[PDB]
Design a protein around this ligand. Structure first.
Ligand SMILES: [Ca+2]
Ligand SMILES: [Ca+2]
Ligand SMILES: [Cl-]
Ligand SMILES: [Cl-]
Lengths: 103, 460
């Protein structure tokens, strides 16, 4: 399942100040050496409620948070990153990603 | 805008989603329940994000609103906000707004969030002089002249067609600026913004960073994906803790040597061969050095606090300097020339180990790394020292699994055969080389991969 994913651990302090959206980490697949890779995310906080708290820039793999977080409301988020070619074909197995909300 | 008679909620708020929301807000039971202006006058805040609202018709009657959230909706027309002058904060990111003329007279605004819309013309923001937070990224703005009088701004972003940063000259209250993904090459105006603490300028066309020299309050800087080479100016920015210079043309790291507050440093996809200047950067927990020209990575042994390290796509044979980095949790070094991984047995905290496209033949030293959750060992390759050609030439299979057992070849060239431990050919004439491949799924701890590769045997 690792394949060619390159992903740093993701943590966001609660009550961050703007400007939003705030860059968290840049996700990458080393499959990008053989063709363009496009990134997406699914999961609670991404494509299901609360929708779009986290977003990813499909061409750069920049994962971003769109609003302040509150650790008491939601202390963690489980997302999945996806990497596809220009033709819609996955070049990686989806990677489960944990987002920890800190102080 | 005032209701003069008791009116059904859904006759005020014509959008189905907003009528449902207002019903709850106004403490009513049915969307057809009646309300008066005295009921509406009590609404001073509204959190109506993520509700599939297409129209805010009816909000004009909520005369006492000070703070609204309509982010992540389907809004286009925002005319009903025109006369709500008590508004101080608007969250309206991720809608389909093009026309922001209705915001023109909301002079008490201190926060305005409009990123991810379809805005080009920001002239209606020009009188909003009380703004301290303004977000305009992921729009199609090219002209930022309207920002020139917004002299209380502290936090600002915009995009994605801006080339001329001149209107920022007088916004010296700026502390956090994000100009990523514009068409900016000239950042000379930033030298005026001496209170900047955070500057994000990824994916631009910047080659000259001399304007940053006097921005000594900077603690966070990202110039990822520009045209940087000479980074001499960075030596002035001694308060930097987070620095991203990936995807540039940098070779000389000497300017970074005194930046000892750095805890995160990204230098991937540059032209680096010498990392001696990083030796004193002992507070680093994250370091990215992938896609460079590294061979001698010995200075890395100094970086004892590293928990995240990338080294993939370099020219590294000797990985042993990383074995000092006992706190490492994630290590990526695919696409190098590493064969001996025995020193990595010392990385007792490792969780992710990415080592494909090296020259690894023996997994045994890794056997006790049972906390691994992610693993990559595919597509190894190496060339053996030449052996003498002879018709019945034979070589030992050296490929060893984590269990200590040899892995039988997947394929063998020239009709060759295997009987553990020996691969034997039966050649009719001289041939310059023979070869074999292997492919073996393996799990260490919870990390699964295919340990695979190709072994070339030259024949003299
Ligand atoms: Ca809290
Ligand atoms: Ca103000
Ligand atoms: Cl509310
Ligand atoms: Cl990189």
């Amino acid at each position: 399942p690792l394949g060619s994913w390159v992903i740093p651990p993701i943590s966001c302090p609660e009550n961050e100040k703007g400007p939003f959206p705030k860059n968290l980490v840049q996700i990458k697949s080393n499959k990008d050496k053989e063709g363009k890779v496009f990134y997406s995310i699914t999961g609670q906080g991404a494509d299901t409620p609360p929708v779009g708290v986290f977003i990813i820039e499909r061409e750069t793999g920049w994962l971003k948070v769109t609003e302040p977080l509150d650790r008491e409301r939601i202390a963690t988020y489980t997302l999945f990153s996806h990497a596809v070619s220009s033709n819609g074909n996955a070049v990686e197995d989806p990677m489960e990603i944990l987002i920890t909300v800190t102080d | 805008a005032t209701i003069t008679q008791d009116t059904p909620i859904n006759q005020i708020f014509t959008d189905t989603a907003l009528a449902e929301k207002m019903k709850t807000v106004l403490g009513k039971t049915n969307v057809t329940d009646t309300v008066s202006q005295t009921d509406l006058d009590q609404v001073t805040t509204l959190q109506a994000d993520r509700l599939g609202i297409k129209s805010i018709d009816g909000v004009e009657y909520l005369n006492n609103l000070t703070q609204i959230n309509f982010s992540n909706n389907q809004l286009t027309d925002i005319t009903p906000l025109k006369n709500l002058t008590k508004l101080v904060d608007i969250l309206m990111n991720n809608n389909q707004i093009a026309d922001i003329t209705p915001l023109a007279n909301l002079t008490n605004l201190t926060g305005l969030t409009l990123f991810n819309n379809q805005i080009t013309d920001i002239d209606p923001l020009k009188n909003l002089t009380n703004l301290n937070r303004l977000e305009l990224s992921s729009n199609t703005i090219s002209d930022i002249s309207a920002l020139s009088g917004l002299t209380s701004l502290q936090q600002l972003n915009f995009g994605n067609q801006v080339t001329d940063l001149k209107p920022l000259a007088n916004l010296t209250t700026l502390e956090r600026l994000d100009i990523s993904s514009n068409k900016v090459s000239d950042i000379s105006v930033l030298a005026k913004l001496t209170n900047l603490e955070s500057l994000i300028a990824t994916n631009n066309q910047i080659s000259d960073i001399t304007p940053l020299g006097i921005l000594t309050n900077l603690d966070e800087l990202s110039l990822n994906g520009n045209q940087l080479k000479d980074i001499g100016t960075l030596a002035s920015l001694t308060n930097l803790t987070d620095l991203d210079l990936a995807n540039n043309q940098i070779s000389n790291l000497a300017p970074l040597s005194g930046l000892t507050k750095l805890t995160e440093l990204k230098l991937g996809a540059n032209q680096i061969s010498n990392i001696s200047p990083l030796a004193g950067l002992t507070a680093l927990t994250n370091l990215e050095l992938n896609e460079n020209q590294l061979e001698d990575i010995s200075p890395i042994s100094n970086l004892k606090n590293l928990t995240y390290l990338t080294l993939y796509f370099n020219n590294i044979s000797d990985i042993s300097p990383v074995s000092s980095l006992t706190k490492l949790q994630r290590l990526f070094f695919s696409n190098n020339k590493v064969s001996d991984v025995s020193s990595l047995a010392n990385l007792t905290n490792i969780n992710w180990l990415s080592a494909g496209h090296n020259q690894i033949s023996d997994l045994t030293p890794l056997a006790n790394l049972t906390r691994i959750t992610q693993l990559g060992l595919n597509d190894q390759a190496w060339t053996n020292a030449p052996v003498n050609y002879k018709a019945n030439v034979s070589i030992p299979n050296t490929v060893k699994n984590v269990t200590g057992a040899l892995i039988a070849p997947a394929t063998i060239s020239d009709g060759g055969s295997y009987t553990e431990p020996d691969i034997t050919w039966n050649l009719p004439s001289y041939t310059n080389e023979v070869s074999y491949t292997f492919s073996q799924p393996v799990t260490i701890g919870k990390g699964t991969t295919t340990f695979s590769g190709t072994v070339t045997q030259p024949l003299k």
